[PDB]
Amino acid sequence: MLRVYHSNRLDVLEALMEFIVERERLDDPFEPEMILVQSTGMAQWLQMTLSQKFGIAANIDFPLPASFIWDMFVRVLPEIPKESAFNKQSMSWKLMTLLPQLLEREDFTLLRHYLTDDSDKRKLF
Amino acid sequence: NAFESGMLFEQQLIEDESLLRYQACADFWRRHCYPLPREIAQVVFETWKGPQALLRDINRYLQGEAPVIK
């Protein structure tokens, strides 16, 4: 089941989620309540508002969406590594390795005529 | 249009083309006037003394497009 609430202002939906927690508390009291936000500013605002409203805080965690989805993967499927083998630096160094082999394959003619003139690896980087 | 032109992707932009010009002209005066004998260098000294005096009369020719010499 899935729920969607449209919104004009935000404090009424804060009261709505507070009402949801009021009408139903988690069966396991030690269970952390996952909450997703898109900004650390919204994270701090939810922290301060919810702590002020309840007086205290109770099992509140703020992960970014990609981290949350990875946390879902690592618990739903086996053999998944804890972090990806494809990051914005890993492809950078691997392309550093793989471009000089793949020069002159009759398809990279413009790349050859641009890069092979004169360099000290800066343009390649 | 990057590849066929030959541009880098980040450009530290500067606009003061005088200091580098004088600094490089000093090297030319250093390496093309020093080992002359005195009997030749006297006539060179007569026209203009140093690189600072030399740059004043040729600064406007260097900028922009290089002309064609008769």
Side-chain angles (χ1 to χ4, degrees), chain A residues 110-111 113-114 122-123, chain B residues 2-3 6-9:
Chain A
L110 61 89
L111 284 183
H113 291 319
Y114 150 76
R122 191 182 283 103
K123 324 192 75 170
Chain B
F3 307 98
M7 271 315 98
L8 194 66
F9 301 141

Side-chain angles (χ1 to χ4, degrees), chain B residues 8-28:
Chain B
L8 194 66
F9 301 141
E10 290 83 4
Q11 293 307 107
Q12 175 178 124
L13 270 182
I14 53 174
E15 76 280 350
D16 61 17
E17 296 279 79
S18 173
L19 181 55
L20 310 169
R21 200 179 289 176
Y22 167 81
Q23 186 150 352
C25 173
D27 265 336
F28 156 74

Side-chain angles (χ1 to χ4, degrees), chain B residues 13-70:
Chain B
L13 270 182
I14 53 174
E15 76 280 350
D16 61 17
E17 296 279 79
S18 173
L19 181 55
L20 310 169
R21 200 179 289 176
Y22 167 81
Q23 186 150 352
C25 173
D27 265 336
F28 156 74
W29 186 274
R30 189 167 326 271
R31 81 148 62 100
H32 274 170
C33 294
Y34 273 46
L36 271 194
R38 185 220 43 68
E39 76 173 4
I40 305 189
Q42 205 272 345
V43 181
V44 176
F45 171 72
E46 182 65 26
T47 66
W48 37 74
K49 285 94 188 164
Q52 183 44 241
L54 187 56
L55 193 43
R56 187 195 280 104
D57 299 10
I58 71 152
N59 192 18
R60 68 186 179 90
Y61 283 170
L62 175 57
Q63 58 183 353
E65 177 51 59
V68 182
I69 314 298
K70 198 207 285 181

Side-chain angles (χ1 to χ4, degrees), chain A residues 95-110:
Chain A
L95 284 156
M96 260 295 168
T97 61
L98 290 179
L99 271 295
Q101 277 185 58
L102 273 298
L103 308 174
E104 192 42 59
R105 214 190 179 184
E106 203 260 329
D107 293 331
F108 313 97
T109 72
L110 61 89

Side-chain angles (χ1 to χ4, degrees), chain A:
Chain A
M1 61 80 71
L2 191 151
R3 316 220 63 80
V4 160
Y5 319 127
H6 313 319
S7 173
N8 162 265
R9 59 191 55 213
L10 211 61
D11 58 335
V12 292
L13 282 72
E14 298 325 291
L16 189 149
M17 61 79 71
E18 282 155 1
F19 181 76
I20 285 296
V21 180
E22 279 144 38
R23 62 156 308 278
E24 200 40 66
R25 190 168 42 238
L26 305 171
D27 310 346
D28 178 83
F30 318 125
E31 196 167 357
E33 211 171 31
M34 295 298 102
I35 286 177
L36 291 200
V37 294
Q38 288 194 355
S39 298
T40 176
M42 291 215 58
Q44 276 195 358
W45 196 40
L46 285 188
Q47 272 189 354
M48 182 225 78
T49 51
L50 200 56
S51 190
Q52 188 274 331
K53 257 80 174 178
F54 289 167
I56 58 172
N59 290 319
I60 301 168
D61 292 329
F62 289 159
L64 63 89
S67 67
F68 173 78
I69 295 310
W70 211 252
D71 188 23
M72 185 63 72
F73 281 118
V74 72
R75 278 187 252 158
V76 74
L77 287 195
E79 201 263 332
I80 291 189
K82 62 183 181 293
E83 61 86 20
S84 303
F86 290 84
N87 292 321
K88 210 181 162 292
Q89 307 91 313
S90 59
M91 281 66 78
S92 73
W93 287 106
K94 285 168 200 186
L95 284 156
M96 260 295 168
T97 61
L98 290 179
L99 271 295
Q101 277 185 58
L102 273 298
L103 308 174
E104 192 42 59
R105 214 190 179 184
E106 203 260 329
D107 293 331
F108 313 97
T109 72
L110 61 89
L111 284 183
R112 173 190 65 250
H113 291 319
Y114 150 76
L115 183 65
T116 61
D117 312 332
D118 46 350
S119 281
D120 55 337
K121 307 204 151 197
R122 191 182 283 103
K123 324 192 75 170
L124 184 60
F125 198 83

